[PDB]
Amino acid sequence: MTTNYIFVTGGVVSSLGKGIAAASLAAILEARGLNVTIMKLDPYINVDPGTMSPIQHGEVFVTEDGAETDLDLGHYERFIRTKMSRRNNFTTGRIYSDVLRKERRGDYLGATVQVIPHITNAIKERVLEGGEGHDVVLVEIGGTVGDIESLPFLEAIRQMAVEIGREHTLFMHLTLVPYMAASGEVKTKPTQHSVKELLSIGIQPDILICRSDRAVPANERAKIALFCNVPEKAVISLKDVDSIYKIPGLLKSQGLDDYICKRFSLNCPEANLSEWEQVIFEEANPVSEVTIGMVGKYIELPDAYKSVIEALKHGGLKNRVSVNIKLIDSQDVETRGVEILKGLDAILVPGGFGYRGVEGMITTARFARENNIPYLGICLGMQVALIDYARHVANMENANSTEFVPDCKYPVVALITEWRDENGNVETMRLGAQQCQLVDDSLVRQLYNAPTIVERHRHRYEVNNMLLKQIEDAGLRVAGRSGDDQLVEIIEVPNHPWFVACQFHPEFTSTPRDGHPLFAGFVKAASEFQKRQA
Template sequence: MTPLIFVTGGVVSSLGKGIAAASLAAVLEARGLRVTMMKLDPYINVDPGTMSPFQHGEVYVTDDGAETDLDLGHYERYLRTRLSRKNSITTGRIYDNVIRKERRGDYLGGTVQVIPHITDEIKRCIVEATEGFDIGLVEIGGTVGDIESLPFLEAIRQIRTERGPEGAIFMHLTLVPWIAAAGELKTKPTQHSVKELRSIGIQPDILLCRSEQPLPDSERRKIALFTNVPERAVISAVDLDNIYKMPRRFHEEGLDAIVLDRLRINAGPADLSQWDEVVDASEHPVDTVNIAVVGKYVDHQDAYKSVAEALKHGGLRQRTRVKLKWLESSDIEQQGVDALKDVDGILVPGGFGDRGFEGKVLTAKFARETGMPYFGICYGMQAAVVDYARHVAGLSGANSTENDKASPHPVIGLITEWRTSSGEIERRNEESDLGGTMRLGLQEQRLKPGTLSREMYGRDVVAERHRHRYEFNNRYRTQLEDAGLTISAKSMDDLLVEMVELPRDAHPWFLACQAHPEFLSTPRDGHPLFVGFIRAARERKAQAGGRLLKEATA
């Protein structure tokens, strides 16, 4: 069976278990191992798909269309492994699976209990997600002591008992707070957190001690003594100014060597040169650009985590620091577009619902009319299409049926509203479940030769991940193309519009896509569209600087 590393967290939430686990996974991968990761979340929702971004943050989408926790985004940005729905499990999904089995009679009429039925299902899911790899990391969401995490903790305790210390180990991330008034690091919270774990039968093998200050040897020895963890395995996880430094830092602390020793795994030396290049590019930029992100949830920026990271990745590929200016689209509606005038590029990300949509439309209009580089993603593409329909094609009242079911020109709508055998528009919004018509997961699309999109990708067919319900209405394809809008990518069956753009002679860089390319961006590789967008922003900035210099010397 695949050796496992179970990652738990203690004292407080938001310590960074996901990034810490992904960083360790990156080092293990750099040593030539095939590594996978998994997230066990204690909430009862079956998946995050219908959860509010204000509560949960971003819904991350995998190739197979799973709507998952945002930590899977961290995993895929640090690893070469592509994850699937198997790698994100919630309490809700576990109970749903067990109830379905009970309804089918799989338990032969027996009493269904947390132990063994729930814990057995958790163990089955862990094995299914990690089999075939050299090593698997499994992160348990929440904080040790939370009542909802107990079934997961019991399941991993059982796995350790069944497999022994060479088949599964426990790594616990905890907080060692710095008390400024006393001028000391305090180890007591860590001691109590480990005590809580040990009370349910789990003895950590490794401690990652998160702190503002490096952990002195004296404190390391104290923690080791009171937690029964070898001093060598008490790792100082000091705060870093760059999360991509973490793989190198953990390697220097010997974390990967400890893991491999405990699991009796032989591996080659760690080649972290690509991570060193990422860090060097981020710390020694040759340029800086300011990008406005105009969204609906900017007060909770985790809702756009992958977008923010992908923008930074696009800058890394050309040693450019990307500074983000977060703007609420509803503020654009109320206050106008003045806040957009001091940036070098504009990105409008995805979203749902009518709140703030008109602000996105105004943003697309501003970028189109001023030559500002514009990158629309999902709802950002739909906003660009609505703007073009209203203000260029002359389709007064054009809108998405998501926001105006009575629009005289529904240029965006559900497929069921414009694709019927009789050719008549049907209104079926009320009949569609929220996820019933959702287009999810990796899908191929064909790019039109001679377009900006084709230039950015450098190939004719690409695949991107999707998460949306509403589509470009095919009934308006010809009308909008005749008005000058370029449809630069379509689905392989030619049915669905995937990308639109403005011709290069009309705008230097205006591109919008229905998919979510941010989900396939990594710090080591970037993504062609984000790299191209940041390059366009740099060119815009250089032109503006040249213009100002010319005016100053005139």
């Protein structure tokens, strides 16, 4: 068994959906019974994505092993079952850190460390590492062709391709075929040049992807084929669609996978894409609709809550109900007030960092709680709900977190070391998939249908056990506790129709085909509430 590789690049303009295209392909390859995986190389100096804000790049994906990575790794999780790890994604900065460290400790024995060959060695070794044991490995190269930001990666690839032979490698290149309404037609010139640019750095494309807002005519595809040294059948058209889940169908329709196995001499079984066909059918034919309001901070760029949005969508798919998300700034609830929260069937509060208008988030939690409006809280949203309940029901005046107000007096959230009571008596970050002991009598235990569950984490401060007993005894159900320290993983409100909040990140496990119990429950409850109010 020898591993085959396909490289993905893109030119002309960014934001064409390279990760989307790659994931869609991989889904098909899995559907054909092939051991396919995927990695992404990122043109950034940032070593870890954790050093950047949510508004800067959107949500930072949490892998099973706790690694912080590019959002697209979560996208990969939503198309293939191969699990991603720290080996599936790294940056330019990461490379330099490693190489410079090797220099420092004498690993290059007095030699000059150069881009060629030393930086490219770091790269190609990481690629081979991640591709170990797989039939097909997709490698997405971030950045845009022709820009200096990723030329080292492109060079490493060229070298690799030569080393492994053309029989184990294909070049897939995304382009843009823009529509010019003034002329009444699309243009191909930009594409022709994009290809020329790859050629100038030693790369000859095998497969072309023509992104556009409409199907590209065969004639135009032929013209491209001519100028790019590519067979007509290898020029694929890819018009804009209203759902990513429909892309596998399109790629399959144009015979992409057949071509690929032919190129790799693989006797590949016919792709079973019916799993997504089902999803598509259900997606396009919901029986109902429901309005979900979301209160947060990074709503100025939906990418920040992308994983959440997708998870909500998945709940909707399972309940055949359209999910309408209202973006609400916590600072407006703080300013304008709860009037914002009117007209909602259910309310959701996401995680994240920053004090900002969190008091408005608390106000919102209070609102949904007291008005029996289905509620779902995640990470920070749980912290918020905790404060709400504690301060207004358990009478914990100024219930708060030490991360914002160390001298709280009622630090309902604090570092385990920082746990303390209102009298000053006392007694890093949790990451990745961790086992949570669910309370057998809780709803969540029954929603998952299991004694324990395993879910992803990312947070530093915990529920302060010193005061927990006040909150819990006041009438709040701890629906589940972690493990060794029995940390409050998840809570439920005794008499609320559906009020659930947790420490873990269910949004990194939900898929369009499998769904997820908490979103199924939340969204269903949302619909139920809507009907109860009508």
